[PDB]
Amino acid sequence: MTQAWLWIGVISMALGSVFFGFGAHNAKNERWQILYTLNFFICLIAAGLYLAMALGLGVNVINGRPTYWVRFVTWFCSTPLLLLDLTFLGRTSLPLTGSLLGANAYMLVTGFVATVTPKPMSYIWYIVSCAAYLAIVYLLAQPYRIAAERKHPRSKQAFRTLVTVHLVLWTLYPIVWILSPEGFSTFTQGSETMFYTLLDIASKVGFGFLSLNTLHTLE
Amino acid sequence: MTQAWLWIGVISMALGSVFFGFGAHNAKNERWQILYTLNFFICLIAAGLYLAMALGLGVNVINGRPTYWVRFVTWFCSTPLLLLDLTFLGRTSLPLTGSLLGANAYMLVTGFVATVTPKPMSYIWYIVSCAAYLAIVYLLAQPYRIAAERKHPRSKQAFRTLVTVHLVLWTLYPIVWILSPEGFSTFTQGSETMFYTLLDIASKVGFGFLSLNTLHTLE
Amino acid sequence: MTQAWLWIGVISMALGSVFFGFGAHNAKNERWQILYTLNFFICLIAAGLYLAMALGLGVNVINGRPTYWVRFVTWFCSTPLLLLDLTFLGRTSLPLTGSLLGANAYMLVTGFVATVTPKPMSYIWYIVSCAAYLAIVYLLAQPYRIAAERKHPRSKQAFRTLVTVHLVLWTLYPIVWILSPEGFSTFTQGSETMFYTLLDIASKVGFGFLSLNTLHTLE
Ligand SMILES: *C/C=C(C)/C=C/C=C(C)/C=C/C1=C(C)CCCC1(C)C
Ligand SMILES: *C/C=C(C)/C=C/C=C(C)/C=C/C1=C(C)CCCC1(C)C
Ligand SMILES: *C/C=C(C)/C=C/C=C(C)/C=C/C1=C(C)CCCC1(C)C
Ligand SMILES: CCCCCCCC/C=C\CCCCCCCC(=O)O
Ligand SMILES: CCCCCCCC/C=C\CCCCCCCC(=O)O
Ligand SMILES: CCCCCCCC/C=C\CCCCCCCC(=O)O
Ligand SMILES: CCCCCCCC/C=C\CCCCCCCC(=O)O
Ligand SMILES: CCCCCCCC/C=C\CCCCCCCC(=O)O
Ligand SMILES: CCCCCCCC/C=C\CCCCCCCC(=O)O
Ligand SMILES: CCCCCCCC/C=C\CCCCCCCC(=O)O
Ligand SMILES: CCCCCCCC/C=C\CCCCCCCC(=O)O
Ligand SMILES: CCCCCCCC/C=C\CCCCCCCC(=O)O
Ligand SMILES: [Br-]
Ligand SMILES: [Br-]
Ligand SMILES: [Br-]
Ligand SMILES: [Br-]
Ligand SMILES: [Br-]
Ligand SMILES: [Br-]
């Protein structure tokens, strides 16, 4: 059931918050404190999201099905900080950070429209959102990777691992969406919740630990 | 169904036993033989547990629901050896080993009471068990980590990885418990089985391979 | 439902194809192009398989249950290339490649018979197929590992990781089979699909990324 996974989510993120929060405190230097604090805020925003969803908030019947539009509201706050985990580690220039957050915000706003609009109009917005996502796929794979690798020549595998894990994780969201009742409806309203909660935990708690491991490698 | 996962469990642990048992035999030295044998015994105890549960043993109706109390009986034997995987690798002093096994045994006995007592009395014992667990969280994170790192200065990341994977894995057991019919009952009696079988396989077969990889790093 | 997982499979492999195909193009040298192309073909064969299964092809009622015999048809093409990922990396001699592909082909043909024959005759063919699989377990663990380690003395952990991940992944297929309606029928026709789709994705997309990481280590 959706409630069990929303609750699984509530505890997962809150426990991710405590872990990073304890790392934020007793941190070695500024570089380490920032990274631990970025991941602390990400998991706090997510714990907040899951707490509201589990208590029946942020949901409404849209086109005959329960829709947790609150996901867009909070994803709009955590995802720029997830992209900040990458740019902070890469020591990326601000114009490239601007582009990433730019294309990220675009993706969520048009992604939100596809979620609240009926069929077949929703497919247009899905396509537009996927294109904003494919713009992000290019930026991380080419300008971001080339700049981070020149700035860290002995750690080309760290950013290679960062980007690939970021690509696998973020690509499964439009896959879940188009297979859920929003698209082709291959599975129920309960599976959508489960898939999103496992994806969210991995994309924030899981990625959190990866970026810290990535910093250990850089030294 | 619970039966499919109990059977998934039976084969998983038995195959973990063969793998470590074959490693126990044809081992390089004493340090390697011990580690392979520790993990061999852990998986044997677990294969035994799952074999009894699958055949309908160690279960009884407690407060109106099937309860596999046999989990506590066998967890009481495998978990001290899981903690021995850490202390053997860290080359930890005996007083610290005493403390860990001490607090581990406490956690399972009070954890067992919470499992067999009705609501709301069960919540008291859950809280006490969680406190015995939080005592373990401190011991691994602070005295254990500081001693293992001084004894191995070039492998601070090995014990860092050991402890974190040990923390993530062991924390999900009280989460499963409090969400199952024992606590807030967010999910069925079938999901509890599934979650525990995936957790057990990871905490013994999965952790088994991690500790061997941790020894490879130490050389 | 089976349809949701078959569709999950269709997109997973197709996205694995694009990733490796883009790696195949813009590759550093011949050693890198070959590896990226091997994994590109593997995922293409798998995307093809899942596309046919999702559209209702390659299935027929055998002994009173839907049976996707098409799995054997395509597994017969992808698995020799999965074994080629190992031998290409190990720089293995052709007689050992011959033996592996030999025993692999045997396993699938007798494995296919067990799938299409009734009970209890099916158990004989299962046993024969498992023995062809245990012949593969020996070849990878002993002749393959000893040759790859002499040819790469500073990367004994790369092939150690290759083989173990290959063993864990490939062993779960006869476990799924014997627990499914083909054997002891512990779970439904829907769980069999799900388990096979998660196993296939890991054994091709997952293993694909591992073998590339293994090449990075070799340099
Ligand atoms: C913790 C939450 C994260 C990392 C959210 C990720 C969401 C996306 C990458 C957006 C995916 C979508 C498309 C690209 C197509 C339209 C439908 C969406 C919004 C699910
Ligand atoms: C292979 C089995 C393992 C590693 C068992 C782990 C079990 C625990 C860490 C105990 C968890 C519990 C609490 C701390 C609260 C009360 C309920 C328990 C017994 C599930
Ligand atoms: C991508 C597909 C892969 C890697 C297929 C793997 C299949 C096997 C290793 C075969 C397993 C079987 C036995 C050894 C016993 C009989 C039943 C089978 C065919 C499931
Ligand atoms: C830097 C980029 C910032 C993001 C800008 C997003 C661009 C928005 C453009 C089109 C979205 C349409 C407006 C959403 C209204 C939908 C109405 C509804 O709720 O159904
Ligand atoms: C009965 C309904 C049949 C189901 C049809 C499902 C076929 C899948 C079709 C389209 C999948 C969408 C493509 C995945 C999004 C890619 C976006 C990206 O990351 O670039
Ligand atoms: C911590 C250092 C280890 C870095 C290696 C990371 C490799 C694992 C990465 C991705 C695999 C996880 C993808 C599967 C997500 C599960 C959620 C879902 O799809 O439902
Ligand atoms: C070194 C620590 C060893 C472990 C000691 C555990 C302490 C036991 C204290 C209290 C538990 C209560 C006794 C259990 C009886 C419960 C009765 C029942 O089965 O319902
Ligand atoms: C309808 C019932 C609502 C469900 C309420 C669920 C709220 C979750 C509340 C408490 C979770 C327990 C905290 C997790 C245990 C932490 C123990 C530890 O590792 O330190
Ligand atoms: C073998 C060396 C690799 C070491 C890195 C290990 C990182 C992965 C660790 C933990 C992630 C797994 C946690 C999820 C457990 C699944 C069981 C469940 O929660 O139901
Ligand atoms: C190099 C090894 C090549 C593989 C050879 C496989 C050996 C085949 C031997 C016996 C399998 C029996 C023939 C299959 C017919 C089954 C009839 C049916 O479809 O039900
Ligand atoms: C009601 C039915 C009871 C279910 C009985 C299940 C017992 C499991 C029995 C046999 C499992 C088969 C052994 C696993 C295959 C090993 C092949 C290999 O990798 O070597
Ligand atoms: C990419 C480099 C990392 C290498 C370490 C790999 C360790 C993980 C390996 C195996 C664990 C996955 C096994 C579980 C398969 C899930 C599918 C299923 O059983 O249903
Ligand atoms: Br969020
Ligand atoms: Br560097
Ligand atoms: Br156990
Ligand atoms: Br060291
Ligand atoms: Br295939
Ligand atoms: Br080497």
Backbone angles phi, psi at B24, to 5 degrees: -60, -45
Q: Of C198, C12, C209, nearest to A175 (Cα)? A: C12
Please tell me the distance from the alpha carbon of residue A94 to that of residue B194, in angstroms, as a whole number: 47
Tokens coding C55 = 């559209």
A96 Cβ contact partners less than 8 Å away, ≥ 6 residues apart: A87, A139, A143, A144, A147
Distance between CA atoms of residues B140 and B173, nearest Å: 17
Q: What is the total count of domains within chain C?
A: 1
Experimental technique for the deposited model = X-ray
Residue B107, ligand 2, Cβ within 6 A: yes
Contact (CB, 8 A) for C105 and C148: no
CATH number at residue C71: 1.20.1070.10
Q: Subunits with at least 3 CB pairs below 8 A relative to chain A? A: B, C
Residues less than 5 Å from ion ligand 16, measured at CB = B 152, 154-155
Cα–ligand 4 centroid distance for A113 (angstroms):
7
- Rounded distance between C-alpha atoms, residue C131 and residue C137, angstroms: 10
> Distance from the CA of B96 to the center of ligand 7, in angstroms?
22
Two structure tokens written together for C59: 């299935």
CA B1 to chain C, closest CA, distance in angstroms equals 7
Burial status of residue C104 (CB atoms within 10 A of its CB: 0-12, 13-18, 19 or more): buried
Residue A82 to residues A44, A104, A203, A207, Cα–Cα distance (Å): 13, 11, 8, 8
Cα gap C33→C118, rounded to integer Å: 45
Residues at CB less than 6 angstroms from ligand 3: C 75, 78-79, 82, 107, 111, 114, 126, 129-130, 133, 170, 173-174, 177, 200, 203-204
Q: Which residue has the tokens 């002891």?
A: C184
Integer Cα distance of C55 and C75 in angstroms: 18
Q: Where are the alpha helices (DSSP H) in C61-120?
A: 70-90, 94-116
Question: Residue B7 and residue C179: Cβ atoms within 8 Å?
Answer: yes
Residues B182, B67: Cα–Cα separation, whole Å: 9
For B66, the 3-state DSSP assignment is strand
Question: What's the rounded Cα separation, in Å, for the pair C119 and C178?
Answer: 12
Q: Which helix (H) or strand (E) holds B219?
A: none
Tokens found for residue C43: 């995922």
Cα separation of B88 and B46, whole Å?
21
The SS3 assignment for A92 reads coil
Nearest-angstrom CA–CA distance, C210 and C208: 5
């373990």: which residue's tokens?
B136
For A216, name the nearest residue in chain B, comparing CA atoms only.
B157
At residue B119, φ and ψ (nearest 5 deg) are: -85, 145
Which residues in chain B are closer than 8 Å to A19, comparing Cβ atoms? Answer: 167
For a mutational test of ligand 4's pocket, the pick from A79, A104, A106, i.e. the residue with the most ligand atoms closer than 8 A to its C-beta, is A106
Distance in angstroms (rounded) separating the CA atoms of residues C48 and C58 = 11
B109 close to ligand 7 (CB < 6 Angstrom): yes
* C102 vs B67: CA distance, rounded Å: 49
Cα(B198) to centroid(ligand 13), Å: 26
- For B54, residues 6+ apart whose C-beta sits below 8 A from its C-beta are B3, B6, B7, B9, B10
* Interatomic CA distance for residues A6 and C135, integer angstroms: 46
Q: Within a 13 Å sphere around the CA of B214, how many CA atoms are in the beta-carbon half? A: 28
φ, ψ of residue C67 in degrees (nearest 5) = -135, 115
CA dist., res. C88 & res. C218, Å (int): 12
Q: Alpha-carbon distance A24 to A18, whole Å?
A: 10
Alpha helices, H only, chain A: 2-24, 30-54, 70-90, 94-116, 121-139, 145-151, 156-179, 189-201, 207-218
Ligand nearest to the CA of B179: 8
What ligand is nearest to the CA atom of residue C134? 11
Angle between helices C30-54 and C207-218 (to 10 degrees): 180
Boundaries of domain holding C110: 1-219
